[PDB]
Amino acid sequence: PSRQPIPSEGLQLHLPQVLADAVSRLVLGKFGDLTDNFSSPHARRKVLAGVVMTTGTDVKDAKVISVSTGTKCINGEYMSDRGLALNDCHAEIISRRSLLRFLYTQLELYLNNKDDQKRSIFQKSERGGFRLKENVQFHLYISTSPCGDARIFSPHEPILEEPADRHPNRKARGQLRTKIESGEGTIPVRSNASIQTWDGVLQGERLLTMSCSDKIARWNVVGIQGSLLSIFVEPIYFSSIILGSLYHGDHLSRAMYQRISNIEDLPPLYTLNKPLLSGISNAEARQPGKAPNFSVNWTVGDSAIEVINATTGKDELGRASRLCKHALYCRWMRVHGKVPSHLLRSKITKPNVYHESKLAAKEYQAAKARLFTAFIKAGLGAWVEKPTEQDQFSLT
Amino acid sequence: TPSRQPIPSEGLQLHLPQVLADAVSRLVLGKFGDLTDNFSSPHARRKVLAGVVMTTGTDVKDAKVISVSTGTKCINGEYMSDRGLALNDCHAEIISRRSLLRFLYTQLELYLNNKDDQKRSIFQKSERGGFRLKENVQFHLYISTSPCGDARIFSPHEPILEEPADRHPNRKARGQLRTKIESGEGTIPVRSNASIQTWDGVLQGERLLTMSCSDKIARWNVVGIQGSLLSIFVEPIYFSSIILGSLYHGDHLSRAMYQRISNIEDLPPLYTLNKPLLSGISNAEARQPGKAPNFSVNWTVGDSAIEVINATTGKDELGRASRLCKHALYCRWMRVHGKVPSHLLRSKITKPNVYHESKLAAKEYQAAKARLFTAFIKAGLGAWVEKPTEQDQFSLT
RNA sequence: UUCCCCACAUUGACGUUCAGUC
RNA sequence: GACUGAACGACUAAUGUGGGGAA
């Protein structure tokens, strides 16, 4: 009973185990193609993640959208005030950023010519802005349970026998947790007071990054498109979360949504999303050797993968990633001009510095507050953000 | 890196920048060792180390380590003292300056203690009145990392967006005033539309605001390191040098220390915007991530051992007041004020014998303070935050 | 069930050494 | 120098199991 798939909604559109095994095969497969059958230099991974899109029930109408690896976060000294760094390179966190490029691309594809609109996954929304066509779903694959609430208790395979949580009501369950710089495990936020500072970090204060478990729970409320893309499009959710290993149904479902079911007063179109949760039929084996300092990423359409030094947030020659704040902002800005102002979901105008533009997404920003509040009232801690200095930059 | 190179001073150049830096860097750290049974003591665990070195002449070994201190945290708001027994700010460099104040009081006492001792005192009578420094004495500030606040806000693994010298095509003006956040080693900008702190208000739990060291040192580079009370006896003293053991970026530091308020006008006589020598050291400390110790060490030449203060409370572990608190400093000043004949005061002892009122006796210093506050507002850099006026109304014995 | 105490385990940095690539 | 791959040591602050308690 512990390691069994957890169905999603009220009308069931795919077979659970078939999908899980499908997306694990597809992503792990496409990761093979990118690495000349795992023989490549940067093919050594510790954790693998990816996003799969589906257009319909035919499980060969599936497309691998993104593939990524990584287990590390940026060093404190290497934070970039020009937004050129990858602050978090845990596999699944990167696949979401990889997904963002594909969404921007799809927006670009729509506003190119009327003949190309039919090829784009987006369409106009009666409410203003853009929405997905009625049959598009996205699915998250992680080769292992996400760090934090889904993985911290029992980081090892269940021994089945439905070895449910013998102590499900400890204060420590459902707690928000942060990756800590220069230390292992993931730690509660309560016991580590909040509000980070730029200079505080530069001095030696350990950089705190939210756990992947908490980040996805977040994706299950404000959606995966994030603030900037939410100005163009309506909130998008993962339909499924598939784990290639370390699956504990009870733990993952708490961490992914159950713990914030107290959330109220979400803005229109926003909701607490409860995706399909599942392990795969043949769980992945634990990967050999020391864990690599680099984090790989790819998005469908790309000619090559990108290899990032997780320590620094840049590549080997010190170049900014295609996934960093500064690039994503550039894509956003380029599309913002190609989109007519009667077609925006939010018409509030702000200067063109990063933090300020994110603030134009009032509803998304609102949803976030409902989310932070949910965790707090549940006694699960206050969310921890990067120093406010991190997002104060323009496009040169 | 053009970025990691010394910026010579607009003061007196008596030593070579780089020889001097490595000199005071090596001494303070050496003297911090001696105080801690060679770094083996419990209290040798620091995050930040600071110190003051004095020089008497051009020979670069005629130096004396005057003060040594450690600390990265501030008092908790709830724990402030209405009788001035608490140390509101225990940051390494802030603490070094207060210890230096003690060295200043001792040297004044030394002068008016014995006629023979006057030749041993760093002070001399001044023709303009009161006391002034001997014609070659300089003080040098060492900090093991760039001071918190504006001087530290930047990416140390990226080139500088050199401000295009032709009206920022967007908008700019960095250098904004920033405040230490209570229960943290860090800093946040000041609300450009803010409130003012109140005594009963903070004590309940409202944010205590203490200005960042970057903003404090800039203040030292205008009104001097001697503070208000001591300016009644002696003339303004400035650091000739500021040496950094890490996170040194010349253009950033020069900004935070003086360049951002170069718009300063109508300073009183003897007061000026001091532009000291800025420099890093050759073998920089590496960033050591981990907890910042909750305690603050301090020492002043003449002392037998160090004093250790709980930064959160501003007192020591047994709740005894530090030698650096307002009340202690007042005790030293009052001792001197009676030993000094009234024609020799730089301002007339007019006002009553409560702390705040005596600070107002320093008219030229107070004036200097106001021009400084005004420099920051007109520069579009935020308004300075002063503690509620209750902090400073208390008396002695 | 929850917490406490003690013991034993589990899970990103640092240092030492060894092997290679540009 | 940077990156890469194996060994050993020592840190990190949560978390697990057990024994004993407690509500």
Ligand SMILES: O=P(O)(O)O[C@H]1[C@H](OP(=O)(O)O)[C@@H](OP(=O)(O)O)[C@H](OP(=O)(O)O)[C@@H](OP(=O)(O)O)[C@H]1OP(=O)(O)O
């Ligand atoms: O995918 P991630 O690596 O976790 O990045 C996110 C993302 O920031 P960027 O897209 O700008 O990198 C969030 O932005 P949204 O698009 O979700 O709005 C931002 O959220 P805020 O808007 O709340 O700043 C959050 O940062 P924070 O730590 O401040 O929540 C930050 O995650 P990291 O900073 O942990 O990478």
Ligand SMILES: O=P(O)(O)O[C@H]1[C@H](OP(=O)(O)O)[C@@H](OP(=O)(O)O)[C@H](OP(=O)(O)O)[C@@H](OP(=O)(O)O)[C@H]1OP(=O)(O)O
């Ligand atoms: O070394 P610091 O901890 O920064 O102390 C200073 C110092 O006060 P004390 O010497 O009495 O401790 C200033 O005094 P002067 O420079 O005038 O001698 C004072 O400024 P004012 O006395 O002019 O108000 C200021 O306090 P404020 O917060 O009011 O600026 C205060 O700084 P802290 O309050 O951070 O100690």
Ligand SMILES: [Zn+2]
């Ligand atoms: Zn993770």
Ligand SMILES: [Zn+2]
């Ligand atoms: Zn400071």
